[PDB]
Amino acid sequence: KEKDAYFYKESKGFLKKDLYTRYDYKAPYISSDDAFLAMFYNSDVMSKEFK
Amino acid sequence: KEKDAYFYKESKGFLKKDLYTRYDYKAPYISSDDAFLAMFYNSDVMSKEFK
């Protein structure tokens, strides 16, 4: 899947510290556990075929 | 392990947005792959015992 995220560091900007300007992320999201449940625990097609 | 990390959002109060003040993390760090290599591929004590 793809979700929401955030990348942001060192504005190199203004005269007082802790600055950090934000940019927005296109980001690769991966399920590991929900995907497994979908494959074998929610739908039982794969399981039946393999059996 | 425990390492270094970073949590940071919304400094709250400039004329421009994209402010974002940083806070520092105590953070639980987990190896998954390096730990496995240490357990069985770097040192072979566990392996020998099980064999």
Transcribe B3-43 into DSSP letters. Answer: E--EEE------SSS----EEE--EE---THHHHIIIIII-
Q: Which residues of B touch A8 (CB under 8 A)?
A: 20
Q: Which element (helix H / strand E) includes A24?
A: strand A22-24
Position of tokens 């793809």?
Answer: A2
CB A8 within 8 A of CB A22: yes
- B10 Cβ contact partners less than 8 Å away, ≥ 6 residues apart: B19, B20, B21
Angstrom distance (rounded) from CA B36 to CA B43: 10
Token code pair at residue B39? 């357990």
* Test mutation, A10, A12, A18, chain B, max B CBs within 10 A: A18
Q: What is the CA radius of gyration of chain B?
A: 21
Angstrom distance (rounded) from CA B50 to CA A16: 59
Question: Is any Cβ of chain B less than 8 angstroms from the Cβ of A22?
Answer: yes
Token code pair at residue A24? 């927005």
